[PDB]
């Protein structure tokens, strides 16, 4: 296979501001209405998040723009999308994006996502092709439009679909879906969430708690990746590709100390970064979200040598 359509497009990455976002539960331990503080990889608040578009119609007629780049993993990765009609399935996470290293291949092929940690050959323009079988009248998914070879495979797993629809809602949800990917200590752990959003595109002020889905033995360093897509074929009209529109959100993680406020039921609402501003670092000293009127001594500063 390896059918490819680069369709490179210009313009600057449209950025955004994650207000309160990307706060997962960094333990299984159940806590109730306490302020807990750890320094771990997170997406720090008020951060620059790139609102990317995998397929982007800018109207004259048609003009679907396939931009989705191979992206470095860096420290850690955050992800968010709406996609009332799913066009997104999984990610290619790896290093060489080729053989010679393992490959993290997440395919949420309906309905049984078959997570794959293997050695593949990923094409220059990988994505999942979808077509119509004509036998049993079912839309299959050609998975080798992503990658040519599948062999040597180290790991395999299956679970209930992370990507999930509800719909019937004519919008007003958009089914905002977030996935956090953190690769440490032999365990690459996946996080998820599903949220209604009524706003046109960008994110609200609410907190999103992400539980760990599976903690898996991965043992590979992933320095780079790209997302996956679901497209199809059309027939004679003045081949068909780029079903609907596609856009998503990406931001990189970073070690930061958060104070975590659990609820009576352990549902974290308020989280606060300590290093965010000189004001945020004092609230980490009192451990409280209420700061009484007065003067408090935040950590010292030093002048540094030129």
């Amino acid at each position, epitope marked *: 296979q390896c059918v490819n359509l680069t369709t490179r497009t210009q313009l600057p990455p449209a950025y955004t501001n994650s207000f309160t976002r990307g706060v997962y539960y960094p333990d299984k331990v159940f806590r109730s209405s306490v302020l807990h503080s750890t320094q771990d990889l997170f997406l720090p608040f008020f951060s620059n998040v790139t609102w990317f578009h995998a397929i982007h119609v800018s109207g004259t007629n048609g003009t679907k723009r396939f931009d989705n780049p191979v992206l470095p993993f860096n420290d850690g990765v955050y992800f968010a999308s709406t996609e009332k009609s799913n066009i997104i399935r999984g990610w290619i996470f790896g290093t060489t994006l080729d053989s010679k290293t393992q490959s993290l291949l997440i395919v949420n092929n309906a309905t049984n996502v078959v997570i794959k940690v293997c050695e593949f050959q990923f094409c220059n323009d990988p994505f999942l092709g979808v*077509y119509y*079988h*004509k*036998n049993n009248k079912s839309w299959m998914e*050609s998975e080798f439009r992503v990658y040519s070879s599948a062999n040597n495979c180290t790991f395999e797993y299956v679970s209930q679909p992370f990507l999930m629809d509800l719909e019937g809602k004519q919008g007003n949800f958009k089914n905002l879906r977030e996935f956090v990917f953190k690769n440490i200590d032999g365990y690459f752990k996946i996080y998820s969430k599903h949220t209604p959003i009524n706003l046109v595109r960008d994110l609200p002020q609410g907190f999103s708690a992400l539980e760990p889905l599976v903690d898996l033995p991965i043992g590979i360093n992933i320095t780079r990746f790209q997302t996956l897509l679901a497209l199809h*074929r059309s*027939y*004679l009209t*003045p*081949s068909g590709w780029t079903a609907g529109a596609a856009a998503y959100y990406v931001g990189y993680l970073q070690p930061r100390t958060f104070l975590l406020k659990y609820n009576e039921n352990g549902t974290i609402t308020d989280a606060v970064d300590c290093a965010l501003d000189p004001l945020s670092e004092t609230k980490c000293t009192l451990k409280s979200f209420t700061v009484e009127k007065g003067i408090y001594q935040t950590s010292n500063f030093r002048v540094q040598p030129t």
Partner: antibody
Amino acid sequence: EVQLLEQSGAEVKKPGASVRVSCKVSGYTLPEVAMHWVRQAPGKGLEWMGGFDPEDGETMYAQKFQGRVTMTEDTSTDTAYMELSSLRSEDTAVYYCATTTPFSSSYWFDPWGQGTLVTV
Amino acid sequence: SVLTQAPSVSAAPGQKVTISCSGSSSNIGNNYVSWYQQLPGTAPKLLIYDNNKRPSGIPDRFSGSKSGTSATLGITGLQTGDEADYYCGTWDSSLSAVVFGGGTKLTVL
């Protein structure tokens, strides 16, 4: 969009024989789109043949010619064999590989097939 | 075959004249019509599908209509290279199959 493979090649089979017709494709995969067949006799008109039915999901067979010609499909290699049997006088002719869409009625066929004559 | 159109028709170049095909309610009445072109010993080319839809690469100068059991293929702006046979077809539920007419070989005078 798509170009196809040939229908047969040149198949010349003297009387007392029968011939398969294997039409492959390119740019699509075989069972995302339905094939079709038409008799075309030189200096004459079209006579439809074979074919797949968007409704009911069956592969059609022209009633007039039904039972004399059969079709099979290999989805991965995109090989669709049209076997015509029991050679007769007027049945040597170009038989076109054609392809409408199973999704809708799509009486409109693929843009063109290149044609193959047979021999009786 | 089961449909009605003449063997041949002729007209002067650059003129405007069409070709029609007479079916029945059992064939053209409830079904969509297609039209095809072939040059001598060549690949018959889809002309118009549904009588209102041009395939990719078709001059806009062609149109179509369906009046009852009668379907006309709009042919305008005659060219020196437009001489060929045009074939009408539509879905048949009678024998539950695909049908065509005998074909009409145009001549540009």
